[PDB]
Amino acid sequence: GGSKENEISHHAKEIERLQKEIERHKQSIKKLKQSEQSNPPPNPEGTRQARRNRRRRWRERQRQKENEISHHAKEIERLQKEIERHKQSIKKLKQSEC
């Protein structure tokens, strides 16, 4: 080796698949997240197509962009492993009531 690009290419090889996957993953999870955040779009004004067609240009880059800053956030997150949990198995029988 000798240049930095050489090394960067290595990480990018595994990061590219991530920055590209996040677009689908984040969108796949957002469906459920929407319930928590509960921040829907503005009332129907002007033209939903005018904003939907114009936003597509922003959301495109935003998909990967937002992921960039997220990398810093995820770095500092609370771990939820090895915690008290319950398993309501009886529900399987109660629900049946057989």
3D structure, described in words:
With 98 residues, this protein is mostly helical. The chain has a domain at 1-39 and 46-70. 68% of the residues lie in helices and 0% in strands.
Question: Could you list some keywords that capture this structure?
Answer:
flat; antiviral protein; mainly alpha; 98 residues
Alpha-carbon distance between the two ends = 70 Å
Q: Mind describing the biggest β-sheet? A: none
| Percentage of β-strand residues | under 5%
Helix content: 55-70%
Oligomer kind:
monomer
Number of helix segments? 3
Structural class: mainly alpha
Strands, total number: 0
Order of helices and strands: HHH
As a whole number of angstroms, the C-alpha radius of gyration is 21 Å
Shape: flat
Note the topology:
Blueprint: H1 4-37, H2 48-75, H3 90-94
Helix pairs in contact: 1-2
Short overview:
This protein is mostly helical and 98 residues long. It has 3 helices and no strands.
